[PDB]
Amino acid sequence: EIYEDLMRSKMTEYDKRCCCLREIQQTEEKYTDTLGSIQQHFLKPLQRFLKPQDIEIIFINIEDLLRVHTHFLKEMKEALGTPGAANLYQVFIKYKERFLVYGRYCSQVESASKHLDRVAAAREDVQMKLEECSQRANNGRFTLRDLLMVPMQRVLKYHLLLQELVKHTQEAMEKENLRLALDAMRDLAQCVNEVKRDNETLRQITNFQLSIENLDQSLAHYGRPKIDGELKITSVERRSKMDRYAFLLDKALLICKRRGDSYDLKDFVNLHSFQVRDDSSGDRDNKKWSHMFLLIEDQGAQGYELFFKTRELKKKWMEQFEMAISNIYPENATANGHDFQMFSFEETTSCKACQMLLRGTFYQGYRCHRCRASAHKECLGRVPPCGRH
Ligand SMILES: [Zn+2]
Ligand SMILES: [Zn+2]
């Protein structure tokens, strides 16, 4: 609604297509003005009244968004002015990676918002200056907390705006060219969403890190958490059921024992050399704690028996071990000479198969350690052969 209220102020295909071009322009004008409104009526006045570290946390990247969107609006207006806006698609494609600053924004939205509200709850002089700023900017129609939710909503709408314009473009050449911009804007929307998703994962990893004792390494090295919980376990050597707490991540299983407030790490299992084998024995009597599957070292060096309280739990853990092993060893990991392994990309990277961006901030995809080709899990079989021209 906030974005809809902000953007509030029988037909032929050409007439419908021209209405889409008008909406794209007018919404960008109103959007670029809103960034100017947040800067001139909230940022610059509060610079003289809050700490520069406070300024970086609440206003984040906004100053940079306004600069990117001022230039974007100009190059779009120039593209719209030319005959039949034939080169509009080029403006969207050019600004795609320039818009990746929305990654840095959307990640810290709750972080910047939460910070602002306590600041307002604590300082009495801040609370009414913000109420005065809302009046001078829009006559009390939109508050700052609501105004900071507008940039996330905007970057997520470009692909929807371009979807409609594509739907009404008659000329097949211009339609194909607009489809490329639609793909560039759908890719950007996915990156932004994957960034939000990854910070929650990293926040969850940080929490596990604190709760686990005698763990000498960062959990983040073992990928994404899959499932955690209590279970009973036996090994080739210890055939008596031991009550344990486990954390399953893509590359590891941490077998802990509750040592009061904390979980004490007892057994670290690298899933790179382990296989899961189902056991139907528990199905028959369906007695609590009888539901098992085996977790065996691929050369038979070790073999665990994992007991869950219910059949649903067993089924759920099994499915998560399969998903974890599939992530270590995806389909076609060794296709056409490669050796694709889970990789965390530090810089902006595109897939060697589809040319679309690797999404997120953490274990976004795969890297072949031999040729250094980067790729998404789905695109592995389609990457050109290892070490070629
Ligand atoms: Zn790909
Ligand atoms: Zn390779």
Swiss-Prot record:
Q: Which residues form the PH domain?
A: 224-326
Which sequence ranges form a coiled-coil region, renumbered to this chain? none
User: Residue limits of the DH domain?
Assistant: 16-195
ZnF bounds (Phorbol-ester/DAG-type): 337-386
What post-translational modification information does the record give? Phosphorylated on tyrosine residues by HCK in response to IFNG and bacterial lipopolysaccharide (LPS). Phosphorylated by FYN.
Quote the tissue specificity entry.
Answer: Widely expressed in hematopoietic cells but not in other cell types.
Would you say which domain of life the source belongs to?
Answer: Eukaryota
One further remark on this entry is: 'Vav' stands for the sixth letter of the Hebrew alphabet.
Q: What is known of its domains?
A: The DH domain is involved in interaction with CCPG1.
Q: What task does this protein carry out?
A: Couples tyrosine kinase signals with the activation of the Rho/Rac GTPases, thus leading to cell differentiation and/or proliferation.
Q: How does it assemble?
A: Interacts with SHB. Interacts with SH2B2, GRB2, GRB3, DOCK2, SLA, TEC and ZNF655/VIK. Interacts with SIAH2; without leading to its degradation. Associates with BLNK, PLCG1, GRB2 and NCK1 in a B-cell antigen receptor-dependent fashion. Interacts with CBLB; which inhibits tyrosine phosphorylation and down-regulates activity. May interact with CCPG1. Interacts with CLNK. Interacts with THEMIS2. Interacts with NEK3 and this interaction is prolactin-dependent. Interacts with ITK. Interacts with PTK2B/PYK2. Interacts with HCK. Interacts with PTK2B/PYK2. Interacts (via SH2 domain) with SYK.
Record's protein name: Proto-oncogene vav
Organism for this UniProt entry: Homo sapiens
